[PDB]
């Protein structure tokens, strides 16, 4: 569509409006928005926030009193534009310039002793989470979209902890191989301990799809001696192929309102909802709906459904002003819904799509579950537990078990397509540690309460 944001990048034209681009490598996307999302893992003793800030800066936000839900997943993300330095004779990382998104698409070199004009490679978003099990639970069921991953493998610790084994188990489940293991704390770790940790890394990466992955050490605790990553963030650049044109679907991860008390009538704005667009191209002025809508237990007990709709008026990414958004990264929309429903992330776990793109809305379902750990008990008949779907946590009620199969009803309405993933966690001790996951087999539809006046 049309997107400039800042005079650093040129403005796209809202005239053609053609999906024929269909390329992750477009001039006004690799510089404009981060369509390629990369995850970072490593659990404890590394502090990935520091290394993420070293390239982008301060990330992640909260609200303290989230209100209403208080269960929305605390997933954080940031944006960075990598642009390698151009030099006829660059002793790498002298061919590196990557920093934040402020710098234009092709920046004029000002390095001492050389000149020119260097281009970029690809806009990249980084995603992380300050919790161990929640991050794997959330990307297990197709909520965190990514194309590659990184590991910090803390150097200020003993031999790789079982957290690492959990991480390799999760990525083995995910069937992804574009994972870069990055040694940590090389400044405090001496040569002998560095060799020992390297040998342990090689001895533990075997038997996994992550075997043979590039390993490189970074002194991240001091955020100094960062040259190696400064060169291999450009050198290690795997192709993230992506398909764009289809139908617009989105998952809301958070919501809020920008209005402030004392505002007059003429300056009232609608609520804003930010999430991740899964597939399709969203358009300004387009038609969008949310299938679950408002739930209202009537005298019968049936919900109200009501997939309310309103035309989208404004879209943006980070600080720039973008129109005709594309899949990849995390985007917010300033829809025209009244802010009294969009305030303080009132309802999370919804869906967002064009008219006529309403999927099935089943509440009774059947699943195929898989155990992960060794020895474990089979699924319990007529049990209460917690289920996690998309970005949504609720307390279900499993009804029947056909040995390695289960049929379960939900206490709350849920909008899902058949064949997606699901996570199951049991209430134990003083929390719910995750037990397992599965794929939904088939679903009996809830009462069709989609209705209008």
């Amino acid at each position: 569509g049309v997107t400039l944001g800042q005079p650093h990048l040129s403005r796209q034209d809202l005239t053609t409006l053609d999906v024929t681009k269909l390329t992750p490598l477009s001039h006004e996307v690799i510089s404009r928005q981060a369509t390629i999302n990369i995850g970072t893992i490593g659990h404890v003793a590394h502090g990935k926030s520091t290394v993420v800030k070293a390239i982008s800066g301060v990330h992640t936000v909260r609200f303290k009193n989230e209100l209403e839900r208080n269960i929305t997943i605390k997933l954080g993300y940031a944006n960075a534009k990598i642009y390698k330095l151009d030099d006829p004779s660059c002793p790498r990382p002298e061919c590196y310039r990557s920093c934040g998104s402020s710098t234009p698409d092709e920046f004029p070199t000002d390095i001492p002793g050389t000149k020119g004009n260097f281009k970029l490679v690809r806009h990249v978003s980084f995603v992380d989470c300050p919790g161990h099990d929640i991050l794997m639970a959330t990307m297990l069921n197709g909520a965190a979209v990514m194309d590659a991953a990184l590991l910090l493998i803390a150097g200020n610790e003993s031999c790789p902890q079982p957290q690492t084994s959990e991480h390799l188990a999760a990525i083995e489940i995910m069937k992804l191989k574009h994972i870069l293991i990055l040694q940590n704390k090389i400044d405090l770790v001496k040569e002998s301990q560095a060799k020992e940790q390297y040998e342990q890394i090689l001895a533990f990466v075997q038997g996994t799809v992550a075997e043979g992955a590039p390993i490189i050490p970074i002194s991240a605790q001091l955020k100094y001696n960062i040259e190696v990553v400064c060169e291999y963030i450009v050198k290690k650049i795997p192709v993230p192929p992506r398909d764009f044109t289809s139908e617009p679907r989105l998952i809301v991860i958070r919501s809020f309102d920008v209005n402030k008390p004392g505002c007059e009538v003429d300056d009232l704005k609608g609520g804003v909802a930010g999430g991740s667009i899964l597939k399709g191209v969203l358009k300004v002025g387009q038609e969008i709906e949310v299938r679950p809508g408002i739930v209202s237990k009537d005298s019968e007990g049936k919900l109200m459904c009501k997939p309310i709709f309103s035309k989208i008026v404004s879209l943006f990414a980070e600080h720039n002003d973008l129109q005709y958004a594309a899949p990849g990264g995390l985007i917010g929309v300033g829809t025209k819904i009244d802010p009294t429903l969009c305030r303080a992330d009132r309802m999370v776990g919804q869906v967002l799509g064009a008219v006529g793109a309403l999927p099935e809305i089943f509440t009774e379902l059947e699943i195929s579950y898989f155990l992960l750990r060794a020895k474990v008990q089979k699924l319990s008949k007529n049990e209460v537990l917690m289920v996690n779907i998309g970005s949504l946590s609720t307390g279900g009620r499993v009804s029947a078990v056909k040995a390695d199969l289960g049929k379960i009803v939900l206490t709350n309405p849920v909008c899902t397509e058949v064949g997606e993933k699901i996570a199951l966690s049991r209430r134990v001790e003083k929390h719910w540690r995750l037990i397992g996951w599965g794929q939904i087999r088939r679903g009996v539809t809830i009462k069709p309460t989609v209705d209008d006046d």
Partner: peptide, 23 residues
């Protein structure tokens, strides 16, 4: 560091280790 197309791991280890400690 002498070339550009790919690099040896341990060569870069030695280079960075020498750079950080002495100079």
């Amino acid at each position: 560091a002498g070339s550009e197309r790919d690099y040896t791991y341990e060569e870069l280890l030695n280079r960075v280790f020498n750079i950080m400690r002495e100079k």
